[PDB]
Amino acid sequence: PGVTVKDVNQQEFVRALAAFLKKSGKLKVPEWVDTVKLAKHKELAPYDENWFYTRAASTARHLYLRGGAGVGSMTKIYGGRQRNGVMPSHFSRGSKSVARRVLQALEGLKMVEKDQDGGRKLTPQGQRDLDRIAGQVAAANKKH
Amino acid sequence: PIKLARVTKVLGRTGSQGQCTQVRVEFMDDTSRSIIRNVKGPVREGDVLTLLESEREARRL
Amino acid sequence: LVIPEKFQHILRVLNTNIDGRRKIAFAITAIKGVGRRYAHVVLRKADIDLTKRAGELTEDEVERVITIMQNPRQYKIPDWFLNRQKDVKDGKYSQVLANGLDNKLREDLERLKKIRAHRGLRHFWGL
Amino acid sequence: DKLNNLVLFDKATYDKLCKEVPNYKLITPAVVSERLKIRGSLARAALQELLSKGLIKLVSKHRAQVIYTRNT
Amino acid sequence: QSVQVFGRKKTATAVAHCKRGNGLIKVNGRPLEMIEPRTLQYKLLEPVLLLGKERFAGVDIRVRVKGGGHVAQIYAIRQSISKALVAYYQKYVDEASKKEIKDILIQYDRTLLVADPRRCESKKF
Amino acid sequence: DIKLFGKWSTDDVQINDISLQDYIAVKEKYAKYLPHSAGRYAAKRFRKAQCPIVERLTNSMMMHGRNNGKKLMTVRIVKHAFEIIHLLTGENPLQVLVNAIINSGPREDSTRIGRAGTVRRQAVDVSPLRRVNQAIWLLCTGAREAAFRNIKTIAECLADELINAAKGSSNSYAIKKKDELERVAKSNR
Amino acid sequence: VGPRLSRRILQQARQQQEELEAERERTTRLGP
Amino acid sequence: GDSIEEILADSRQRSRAWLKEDEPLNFLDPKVAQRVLATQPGGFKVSADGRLIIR
RNA sequence: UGUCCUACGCCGGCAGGCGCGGGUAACCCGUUGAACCCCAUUCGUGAUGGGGAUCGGGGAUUGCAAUUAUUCCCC
């Protein structure tokens, strides 16, 4: 009977989860959170200055949906199209350092833990926290 | 005056490049008049056409 | 909202005219030697809202932006972010904006000419 | 010739929009931009500002096109 | 009692499993009001909006979709759902009900029970 | 009831031209939820006359290179244009589109002929299917050439073009093109 | 259908049947 | 084997499968294996009398 | 397609370095998490946040060797 993450709109889920992680205040924000482009195919810095919270929320959601992912999988996932000048565009992965830092910060929250078969996955704390905030979002959207 | 008339039978593709169609055309208000017209576009039997000036008949070899 | 009573249509920054009817992160980009990315980081280091227009900044924020502009390293702007990192004559991490860029290009080309390397001779044969 | 749409509201423009916009039978950033000589960002921001006061009815919203109408 | 059918577009293939239920309809664990393009949302709900929710009130369907693109996946989803319903009312409910269902599904959209035989052409030397 | 976009009723839609009744397919058999159907509508001659006319307009918005294949963009444009049309005139946009097509189709055109150096124009009649085709094409061209470099969205210019073509006013691009085509065909009897 | 599409469809159906049928330390010491 | 066409004949790969699509295919039907195939589906002169000429 | 394809961990902001595994292959990269597309934000008809050429500086990688810029990254 409990509403699942998969039963909830994903963008509102990411927004509410980022708000929750900013409210908790236990995330280890790096010093260079202001002075970095998220990948080499970007051109400007993100306007949303709390981009670390949204990226961590998206990473937690992705590791819920498909666990066992490492840093390279996160670089593949947030990769995009690089416009190579007057040359044809190509696909370029995301920056490895941002993926490593969001993974290690979510791990320091006790939200995310390593596994024997590979990279990172969710804790039971992570699963029930996502279920609780998904219940909150479903109450705020479906019941209104 | 604006006139309306049904296609009865298509005579065949006409024009230098086959861009027109010569066709048998009869009115609905008086189903006695019967004229030859040439048209641009795909036509079949049962199509009805809007004729601006319904006096002269089309003529192409 | 509406116009404030102190909206400055044209600013005079580093002997450069700045159109006040523009966003601040691109009005700073209008200065030579500053692009979009460097303007964005210098305005974020000054703790200034980027939704807010350039032409009605007070003088204090303009002066603090300028003091970050000619002094990047003192405000945690990274070393790899600068225009001229290792200057050939006196190696120091610097950021020349208005007249320093034009000048330093001029003596760069002059140094290339005076040693008669291929690049200087070719570029001054180009005109 | 060259358009000279305004970037922040003048007094007369603000007054005439606050007494003329909630009855156009078409409220969209483009049309208010072209009939008030307003750059599109300021016209947009004025439109959610007027929606905040309840004077303007939204009928659909998109990342490319948001469209309004009068209340009654 | 339960059935399992498939539907397809160019390379997008969906498999639908149909069982007794209460009217919970799922693709990849998600509801049909959650599958990514809302612009083609009515393409998902077409058997629902034609056949009514009362005829979906006693059935649970679960669809696993893989391949293709977004539009092709949606078309495979709706084809699999319609074929699953046709199969259920053929195997375990009376024949005549399946007759009017299959009929109205045909004169609305003929592709709801037969695949489109269109695929990318090869290039030869 | 089947309604376009979950809102738009097709029962009150009527065609005022007897020539275009069998070639404008908006009725209870052709009433669809969406203008996206992906049917094999050009594999045989005269098949595309049975297409819903909103789907024909949607397929004809996918023009000029960059917009090729972007059908979800064009159904978004069609939806927003229909909302703008309704919120402007207060009447159903399907009837507005039908009237715009009826007033937009050229009834008499010209054909370039020649034997050697003598190139002339011969007046011919236009079939109803080609009437529908040139009406749709001229409406799309009018909207596209109308906006292209201004604050006006493609949806607003498209809505204005269908509204002014249903009225028959001379401000529309399609009406002006039809007028000059009929004037040339009348001067080349 | 053809070989490749049918192969993918068969694998999808098999996996779906298995995951509908779905819903510790290995015995190092042999004796009870 | 003993079929007429095989006897009267002019005399990775094995994992390829063909479905057939009629009613919708029920994978849970006990008789579905009939609709799943394992292989690909699908000189003389006559005289005036009509007798053939052999040489 | 692959004994150069690469998973994973650490460092760096990025090119990239270090270690430890799999793959002679429908077994590993790889449930090939691709781009257009969809959603939301900013931009407002302005050679402009469109367009990217040509240039100045710095870092890295492949090679006996990069100068007449091998290539990649940042400003």
Side-chain angles (χ1 to χ4, degrees), chain A, chain B residues 1-54 56 58-61, chain C, chain D, chain E, chain F, chain G, chain H:
Chain A
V3 60
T4 300
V5 161
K6 257 166 160 183
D7 292 330
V8 171
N9 192 8
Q10 298 302 284
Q11 294 181 177
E12 294 293 328
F13 186 35
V14 170
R15 277 188 192 103
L17 186 58
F20 170 71
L21 261 61
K22 185 178 184 293
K23 181 266 290 180
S24 74
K26 293 187 287 185
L27 265 178
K28 277 73 69 177
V29 191
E31 293 293 328
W32 41 261
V33 65
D34 183 9
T35 61
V36 65
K37 285 188 308 162
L38 302 199
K40 71 185 176 72
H41 65 264
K42 300 300 163 164
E43 317 200 351
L44 306 189
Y47 319 114
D48 175 338
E49 61 86 19
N50 296 115
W51 67 263
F52 200 83
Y53 297 112
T54 73
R55 182 50 77 89
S58 178
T59 300
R61 200 192 63 90
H62 272 278
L63 273 297
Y64 163 76
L65 300 177
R66 184 170 165 182
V71 164
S73 292
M74 295 298 103
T75 60
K76 181 142 82 169
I77 279 170
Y78 306 87
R81 199 190 54 180
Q82 184 178 2
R83 299 175 79 198
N84 284 311
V86 290
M87 300 268 141
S89 301
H90 279 100
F91 168 63
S92 83
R93 290 186 145 131
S95 82
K96 290 178 281 188
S97 175
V98 166
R100 214 196 313 119
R101 291 296 203 105
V102 299
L103 279 177
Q104 287 168 353
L106 286 170
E107 183 178 1
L109 293 175
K110 300 289 94 175
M111 189 70 93
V112 167
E113 65 183 1
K114 316 269 183 84
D115 59 358
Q116 200 267 330
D117 291 8
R120 274 86 170 185
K121 69 178 182 181
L122 281 197
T123 62
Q125 186 44 54
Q127 294 179 356
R128 66 185 183 273
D129 187 77
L130 297 180
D131 293 331
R132 186 280 308 300
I133 187 68
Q136 282 183 21
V137 177
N141 199 1
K142 273 81 177 170
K143 273 82 167 175
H144 282 249
Chain B
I2 297 89
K3 302 298 290 294
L4 315 166
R6 179 186 325 310
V7 167
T8 299
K9 65 182 181 180
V10 307
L11 315 193
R13 309 302 300 271
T14 191
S16 169
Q17 290 105 14
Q19 66 269 34
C20 286
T21 295
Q22 184 177 2
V23 72
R24 178 66 66 192
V25 173
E26 57 172 30
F27 292 76
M28 283 74 74
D29 49 2
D30 188 4
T31 301
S32 71
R33 285 218 59 199
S34 181
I35 208 167
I36 298 298
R37 290 266 209 180
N38 58 5
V39 292
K40 185 200 294 201
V43 287
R44 57 182 173 179
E45 60 270 14
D47 307 328
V48 293
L49 274 59
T50 299
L51 294 174
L52 290 196
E53 190 276 331
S54 54
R56 65 181 294 275
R59 186 73 154 171
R60 179 66 65 192
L61 317 180
Chain C
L1 275 79
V2 299
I3 51 171
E5 280 72 21
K6 67 181 178 67
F7 189 81
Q8 191 63 255
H9 294 88
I10 291 288
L11 306 158
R12 188 71 185 177
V13 170
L14 275 66
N15 306 115
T16 307
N17 297 273
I18 303 303
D19 200 4
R21 292 183 291 113
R22 294 178 65 88
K23 299 298 293 295
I24 179 63
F26 307 92
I28 295 299
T29 300
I31 310 152
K32 184 182 226 283
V34 179
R36 265 175 271 140
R37 171 81 149 126
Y38 182 64
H40 273 91
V41 68
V42 65
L43 273 296
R44 198 86 69 198
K45 283 312 202 197
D47 189 60
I48 285 179
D49 197 3
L50 292 184
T51 62
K52 188 268 184 182
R53 298 261 150 182
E56 53 97 18
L57 282 179
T58 68
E59 316 266 10
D60 290 332
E61 277 86 5
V62 169
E63 295 295 328
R64 95 171 77 182
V65 162
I66 292 169
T67 53
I68 307 188
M69 293 177 71
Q70 292 81 323
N71 296 115
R73 298 184 98 238
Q74 301 294 318
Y75 293 120
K76 277 74 69 177
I77 298 194
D79 291 331
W80 48 268
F81 211 75
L82 297 198
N83 280 18
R84 303 276 290 182
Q85 296 179 357
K86 276 164 65 179
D87 185 323
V88 65
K89 66 184 289 184
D90 50 354
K92 64 182 181 293
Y93 290 163
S94 165
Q95 191 46 51
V96 289
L97 310 174
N99 190 359
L101 190 51
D102 291 331
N103 290 318
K104 187 179 289 293
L105 179 62
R106 175 170 59 75
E107 292 84 4
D108 268 335
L109 291 180
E110 182 65 26
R111 186 273 303 278
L112 278 188
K113 184 177 180 180
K114 182 174 71 68
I115 62 163
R116 286 177 276 275
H118 174 241
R119 271 205 278 140
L121 287 178
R122 195 196 158 78
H123 173 268
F124 291 165
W125 180 287
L127 75 165
Chain D
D1 56 355
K2 300 288 96 176
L3 270 61
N4 211 342
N5 294 335
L6 201 59
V7 67
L8 297 160
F9 278 151
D10 207 357
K11 177 69 176 178
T13 71
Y14 181 75
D15 298 327
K16 67 183 290 294
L17 64 87
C18 293
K19 69 173 76 83
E20 184 178 1
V21 167
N23 51 3
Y24 288 164
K25 188 141 73 154
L26 183 63
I27 299 141
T28 300
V31 296
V32 65
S33 168
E34 66 184 1
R35 64 181 293 165
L36 273 296
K37 277 74 69 177
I38 301 299
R39 294 179 67 188
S41 55
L42 181 66
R44 202 155 70 272
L47 261 55
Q48 70 273 16
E49 192 266 331
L50 287 179
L51 189 149
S52 76
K53 317 205 271 201
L55 265 70
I56 293 299
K57 179 67 174 66
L58 183 145
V59 298
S60 79
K61 184 178 184 293
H62 202 265
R63 59 88 174 173
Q65 183 62 289
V66 55
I67 61 170
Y68 308 121
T69 189
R70 65 167 63 96
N71 268 330
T72 310
Chain E
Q1 54 199 14
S2 63
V3 293
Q4 213 190 22
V5 306
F6 72 97
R8 64 179 176 87
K9 191 69 177 177
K10 336 178 183 185
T11 65
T13 62
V15 177
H17 164 285
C18 166
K19 180 67 174 66
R20 283 82 58 85
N22 203 261
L24 294 174
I25 61 171
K26 297 293 183 180
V27 169
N28 278 357
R30 328 193 186 211
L32 294 175
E33 52 283 8
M34 295 297 172
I35 298 306
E36 166 211 2
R38 297 284 75 78
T39 61
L40 294 175
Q41 175 182 351
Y42 279 137
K43 299 304 282 172
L44 287 182
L45 302 180
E46 262 167 353
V48 160
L49 294 174
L50 307 190
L51 281 64
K53 65 178 72 66
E54 292 88 3
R55 183 177 292 171
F56 280 109
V59 61
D60 273 336
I61 62 170
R62 186 179 295 275
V63 182
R64 263 297 299 300
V65 181
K66 210 190 62 177
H70 309 312
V71 182
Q73 279 196 345
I74 286 171
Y75 280 16
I77 285 159
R78 66 206 276 279
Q79 183 168 121
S80 302
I81 286 170
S82 290
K83 285 172 74 172
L85 188 153
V86 165
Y88 184 14
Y89 292 99
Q90 198 269 328
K91 271 77 177 175
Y92 308 117
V93 191
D94 59 307
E95 185 71 27
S97 289
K98 189 269 287 179
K99 297 296 289 183
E100 72 264 11
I101 290 172
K102 186 175 183 179
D103 277 343
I104 190 167
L105 283 181
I106 297 310
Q107 70 273 15
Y108 181 84
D109 186 74
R110 192 268 187 278
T111 60
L112 294 174
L113 272 76
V114 59
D116 189 358
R118 292 193 284 177
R119 82 292 183 276
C120 288
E121 293 292 328
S122 159
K123 299 291 179 68
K124 65 179 72 66
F125 76 106
Chain F
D1 181 35
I2 297 174
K3 282 192 193 185
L4 185 74
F5 291 155
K7 181 67 174 66
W8 295 99
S9 87
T10 80
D11 273 323
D12 62 358
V13 172
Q14 54 92 32
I15 310 165
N16 266 326
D17 208 325
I18 199 67
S19 50
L20 302 187
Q21 184 178 2
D22 268 358
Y23 293 88
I24 299 184
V26 285
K27 206 57 69 178
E28 72 273 15
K29 193 174 180 65
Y30 306 106
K32 303 287 176 177
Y33 291 161
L34 280 176
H36 197 291
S37 172
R40 299 179 68 186
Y41 282 24
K44 186 180 289 293
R45 198 179 191 213
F46 291 109
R47 187 88 74 78
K48 67 213 209 188
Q50 321 159 5
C51 186
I53 208 63
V54 179
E55 180 146 6
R56 304 206 72 206
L57 183 63
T58 286
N59 278 338
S60 285
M61 294 299 291
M62 288 164 27
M63 294 299 291
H64 280 103
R66 44 160 174 186
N67 308 308
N68 283 131
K70 305 197 174 162
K71 208 170 165 175
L72 299 194
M73 185 180 288
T74 61
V75 309
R76 200 260 324 286
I77 289 162
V78 163
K79 173 168 148 136
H80 289 69
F82 272 16
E83 301 269 359
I84 292 170
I85 283 166
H86 187 193
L87 189 152
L88 266 163
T89 188
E91 190 276 331
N92 199 351
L94 287 174
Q95 191 69 84
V96 180
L97 166 69
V98 161
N99 284 52
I101 292 172
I102 279 161
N103 305 330
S104 173
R107 286 154 314 174
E108 182 65 26
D109 211 348
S110 287
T111 296
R112 271 186 60 251
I113 55 175
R115 55 181 67 251
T118 74
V119 167
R120 291 181 291 112
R121 307 215 75 102
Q122 182 67 41
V124 292
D125 193 0
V126 167
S127 67
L129 186 53
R130 189 174 173 86
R131 258 192 82 177
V132 174
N133 291 0
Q134 307 217 25
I136 290 165
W137 188 91
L138 282 169
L139 285 170
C140 288
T141 306
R144 193 168 314 121
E145 294 294 328
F148 180 64
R149 215 178 292 182
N150 59 342
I151 202 71
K152 280 206 75 161
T153 314
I154 179 63
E156 290 159 76
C157 277
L158 179 68
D160 292 9
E161 205 67 354
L162 281 71
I163 284 160
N164 290 115
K167 290 167 170 32
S169 169
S170 59
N171 303 341
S172 163
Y173 176 89
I175 303 300
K176 282 186 283 189
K177 292 309 227 196
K178 182 197 83 169
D179 287 332
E180 61 86 20
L181 282 178
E182 288 193 341
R183 171 144 53 78
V184 170
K186 186 178 73 69
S187 294
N188 280 272
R189 297 289 188 183
Chain G
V1 170
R4 301 178 188 270
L5 278 175
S6 83
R7 169 172 180 277
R8 283 194 286 267
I9 284 158
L10 282 170
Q11 293 179 356
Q12 293 179 357
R14 178 195 172 174
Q15 276 160 214
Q16 200 196 41
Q17 280 162 20
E18 282 173 325
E19 64 91 17
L20 272 296
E21 280 150 23
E23 50 159 49
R24 86 287 184 276
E25 177 69 28
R26 310 167 160 179
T27 55
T28 54
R29 198 258 187 274
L30 279 74
Chain H
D2 291 331
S3 53
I4 292 177
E5 298 96 7
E6 189 149 357
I7 296 170
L8 302 184
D10 302 332
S11 52
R12 206 47 176 188
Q13 196 254 340
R14 317 262 199 90
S15 65
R16 278 184 301 145
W18 283 259
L19 301 184
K20 174 177 182 294
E21 277 272 5
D22 279 31
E23 301 270 6
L25 193 145
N26 182 16
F27 288 105
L28 300 188
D29 190 55
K31 296 194 293 183
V32 70
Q34 293 173 46
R35 295 176 67 186
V36 178
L37 317 172
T39 57
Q40 177 82 47
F44 299 109
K45 53 183 179 293
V46 176
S47 77
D49 194 285
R51 299 155 62 197
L52 279 153
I53 290 175
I54 313 296
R55 210 173 317 283

